[PDB]
Amino acid sequence: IASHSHVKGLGLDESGLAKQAASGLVGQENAREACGVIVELIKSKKMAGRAVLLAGPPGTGKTALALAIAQELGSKVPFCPMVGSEVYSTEIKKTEVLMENFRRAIGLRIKETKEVYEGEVTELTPCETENKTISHVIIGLKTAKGTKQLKLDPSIFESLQKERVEAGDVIYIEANSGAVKRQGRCDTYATEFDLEAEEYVPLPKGDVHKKKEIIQDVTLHDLDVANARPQGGQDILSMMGQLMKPKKTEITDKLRGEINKVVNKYIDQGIAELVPGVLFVDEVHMLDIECFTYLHRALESSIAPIVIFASNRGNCVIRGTEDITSPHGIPLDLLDRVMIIRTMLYTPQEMKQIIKIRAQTEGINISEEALNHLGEIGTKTTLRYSVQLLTPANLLAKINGKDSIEKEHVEEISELFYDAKSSAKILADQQDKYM
Amino acid sequence: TQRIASHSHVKGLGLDESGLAKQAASGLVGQENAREACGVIVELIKSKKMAGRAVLLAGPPGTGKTALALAIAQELGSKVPFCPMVGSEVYSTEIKKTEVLMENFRRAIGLRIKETKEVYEGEVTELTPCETENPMGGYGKTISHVIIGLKTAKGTKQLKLDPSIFESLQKERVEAGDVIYIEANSGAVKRQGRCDTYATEFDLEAEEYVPLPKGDVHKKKEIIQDVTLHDLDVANARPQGGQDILSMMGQLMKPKKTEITDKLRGEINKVVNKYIDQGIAELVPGVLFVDEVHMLDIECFTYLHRALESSIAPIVIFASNRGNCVIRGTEDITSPHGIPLDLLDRVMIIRTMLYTPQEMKQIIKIRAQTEGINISEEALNHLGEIGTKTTLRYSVQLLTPANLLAKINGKDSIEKEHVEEISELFYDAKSSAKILADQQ
Amino acid sequence: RIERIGAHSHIRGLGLDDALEPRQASQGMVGQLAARRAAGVVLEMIREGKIAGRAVLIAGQPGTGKTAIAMGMAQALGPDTPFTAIAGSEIFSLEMSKTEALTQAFRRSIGVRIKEETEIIEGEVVEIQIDRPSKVGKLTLKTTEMETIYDLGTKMIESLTKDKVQAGDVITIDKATGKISKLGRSFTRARDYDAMGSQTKFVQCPDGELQKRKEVVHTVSLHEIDVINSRTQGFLALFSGDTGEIKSEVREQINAKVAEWREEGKAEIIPGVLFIDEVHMLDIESFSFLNRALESDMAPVLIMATNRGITRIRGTSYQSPHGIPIDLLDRLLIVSTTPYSEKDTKQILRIRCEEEDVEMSEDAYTVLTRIGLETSLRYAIQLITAASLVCRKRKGTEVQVDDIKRVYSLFLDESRSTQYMKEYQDA
Amino acid sequence: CSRTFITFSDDATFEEWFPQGRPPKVPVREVCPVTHRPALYRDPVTDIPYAT
Amino acid sequence: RHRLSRRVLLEVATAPDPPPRPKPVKM
């Protein structure tokens, strides 16, 4: 399935200049060679809070360039595609969404080492003692290497009881999280009973006591929401997730402050590695004046990531003010903090080659005559409309017994289907009949 | 207790066997064109065939919309459910507007269900095992049956049960000389304590000794439940009990409706069909009376003719009072009757006429008969006269205070002077409006 | 069984041929050849599901078959393909935002069918022994072809005792979990035959091998996945009212794991359709979100029925065609529906009356078509059942012209009530 | 037809041991000695049932 | 009705009473 897959990179030469036909992107050469500097800045890991505004008429590739920016940096750096309509949340403060997205666009790759206990359990004798709670528990795990006994806390024994485990089965234990899973009974006892509800898993290999390093990559918003909405095993605090489980509002001292301090403590000791992200806030032109005004302090923060806005309107009334208008629907105070990037409106040839590129993406064999007729049909309409009469055309050609698409196919598909402009006149004609 | 209301006089539409409205019958008078129009939809409801039909009672204020609207619930009878609601009940603080509409749509669709179950009661006299001649190898005898003797006020009979019933009894920890409860269809056995008749002394323990159960030891009586689709929906939505800690959240208010349609296309809406086709339940489609519909928001009006197009929906009897008025929630829209043109295109409008002096006089007489007032012929005539000036509401409301003034003045029937004195102590809307316009 | 017919129950699917050529009055769809052909094309595009993120709008005069075409597509699509019908006004919820409602609606039409090959047993219980003291027992299952004896274990015995099955019952034993699902009873009865009990019912025993490898399937929607994965509240995806999904911690993870499952072949894809009726109710923010919500491989196609013309967009003061901004209107291509002619309205009324099982005379058809052409089609359709009741009340057989003419005077369609609204009721 | 047996392989005596007992109740009102009224109490000191 | 007025408490401060020893057998 492909909806915006034709874009796979800015398609730029080593000198930054945009390669006319490359990476499935054609046209907008200036905008792409400009976004080259943006991606170079993002890979530098030096600046913070720099904003960009991809401005242009509808269907001009600003979003295409935004996704090509993500494709250029790769899947290693975090990318957070966000629409301007996600801020109008009813369960949490409006500015909270913006701040948690700014925090969520910051990545944190932290290598971690953890231990693991596993094998076939031989016996489990809970050490009894007077307090009159169970003191400890001796568990013997037999593996292909050897059999060893170990003492664990009563919480692990309780968890095992939750699993309803018995003596002689296979279990997986983790001392870091404390979660103990039930992989099933040992495999050698498959011949014991005729048929049972237990699952049989081969005797775990390797040493009973084994460790391993895991190179995990997460974001700071994950730690923020984990410290704001804690979780754990065998703790009644989980009740918070049943009666007190609305969306959280991490205070300043928690969103900032302590989380940053602990992350710096992890970094400066050689365990973590910072990776900036890219916050692509599309359809920013419809945010509230409050959001625009908070973006001031949001971007000026030394932690804020590189933001790439994308406006569509030319000059309209700012939402939330109801009386004042500004370019792009964004107030001028915020517009001074962004590096606006133009987006040229596509020309007949550029549009034709865009249609061509899009055709070969989702396995469509279009003939040259039909391709050229699509150019004629497009110069009268928008590119996004002319680039969509391909899948219906291919499906209709598959019905006519023709392997390819001809003139008549796209002419009948262009007749069954109308477009915005061609359908607006139909309503203007029958004005007092549509209600 | 009666507690006479404002519409406790309408007993029905008053239609003859041929479907023609009588001049005065079943409390209603006049409005023949309307009482015959809203009578066809009664048969439409009694057919249980159509879904989503709508009839709009559109007329001036006080013409009788609510009068002959709730009278349909009388003709249809109380057996079929009737869910009335005013247009102001949609606005809520914990449930979205367009959802209260759906919740009321399923509350009007009733589903009566019937079940038959045998029942056992009486003091157990003895429980002796029935021997099985060594079914397995030579270990020991086996319980093939268990002879149980139950004592009741009618008589004492011995009965056999299965060995699984014997195990259930043994684990139930009951003894002899007490009252038990058996249901063979399911097998579960319940206990009702001992027999208060002979088993308990003056001791204090409230073991709930049930007296010797009166009646035959074996009894069967079909239980007839009357559950609506909204009741079962809320039940599957807000479970009950004292287990499954998720259900233990009885401290929270939990008003949280907005039943997701997944639970509609899935549960009860499906088991309803599986019981109907099985011959256990009978669907009883009801009525959804929505008066003051002009109060619904534009979103509500839009959702209305999307829920009315569903195969599962009851009839709707709207009552629009406004004339050409602006739709609530929009601007510079002058849709007639305060209802969007699109929705008016889907409803059948029944126009009620304006009452003449004689019809209002009959209405006043009927309301006086209902309230129990012994109004005289002169007082009735004067009430009709002074009601031709104002609306019918004020005219017919001057029966209780007039009767009080009469009783206070040593009377047993409203006289011509009593309503005149009350007519000066109280006045109608127009008089107060003129008095206000004359003042600041 | 008992689910009364609705205004759209008569259409059982688009009356199209194998070449997407709409027939005149086949499969309940009457006239409207162009829009029906367009809907057939988009449906053929739906049953293929190789592109996701497209939209198609059906516009026309009020009462021309927009929702009718939507229901026809829904029916011709059949099950095994999620179809979600929502009105524009349904997303205005109080427990979640508009964008959240739109995401839920979209993901509710994306199905994930996980094929599971679980081996089980299926046979008639002949004998069961269980030695209570751990406890041990045995089981004997019979099928029409063979029989065998099983040496039940402790947990199998526990499960069978919880189910408490007895001889003669036909059951299925999940070798993996041990769940016992009893389909009914074989030709066996009389536990004691002297105790009370309900009526007995019997069904044939299973055939073929006792143990056989069958194929179960679990089909759930992406919305249900994100839901049950949202929080640890047990048995979610029903929960009567509550969805507060998180964007990244849940949604992106669900998408990634579904992609991974498609990679190895656990459950690849089954896209659906989201018919958004009366989309003019959506706010400017809803369209703003829809702009980029369609730009995703997990964005199923949506169908919108519009009745408005050049009218301001809700939530603002911008005049635009179809009450939809030209930003969202740039993707979706529009389909035009032609007003039904005389012979089209007549045949529509004929089919709709034959659906309600009512017989109308030849002149009844003519007069009702006259009314439904001078008036709206919906009123002429509503007058089919109303006129079918007076006839029965007079012990008639088929609706005549007099019954229709009487029920026409009994009610008012749209204009005979506004023209009489000359009394200044209230404003 | 499906029958059901439960056998006490240990010993046939356990066939009766489980359904053992049958101690029917035989109490009656203990009329008081003073006024011959139906007794409602039992004096802890005398142990004699009284009613007034 | 039984508010235990003050003076009653002062009076209750008197030495306690001996317990009984009931073992009668008669009508």
Ligand SMILES: Nc1ncnc2c1ncn2[C@@H]1O[C@H](COP(=O)(O)OP(=O)(O)O)[C@@H](O)[C@H]1O
């Ligand atoms: N550089 C480009 N190369 C090829 N196609 C493009 C390019 N830019 C835009 N398009 C086409 O335009 C369509 C919509 O572009 P979009 O990213 O929505 O622009 P906007 O954000 O201005 O609406 C896409 O389907 C895409 O095929």
Ligand SMILES: Nc1ncnc2c1ncn2[C@@H]1O[C@H](COP(=O)(O)OP(=O)(O)O)[C@@H](O)[C@H]1O
């Ligand atoms: N057909 C009727 N027969 C008897 N009384 C009527 C009739 N119609 C209206 N009324 C009387 O008029 C009063 C007000 O009418 P109501 O139905 O409340 O007005 P509306 O429905 O127009 O708001 C009622 O209390 C009722 O007693």
Ligand SMILES: Nc1ncnc2c1ncn2[C@@H]1O[C@H](COP(=O)(O)OP(=O)(O)O)[C@@H](O)[C@H]1O
């Ligand atoms: N193609 C069709 N075939 C049969 N009946 C139709 C057709 N189109 C519309 N109708 C009839 O019109 C009535 C309402 O149509 P509707 O779906 O509301 O049109 P719209 O969506 O334009 O308002 C339905 O009761 C239906 O019987």
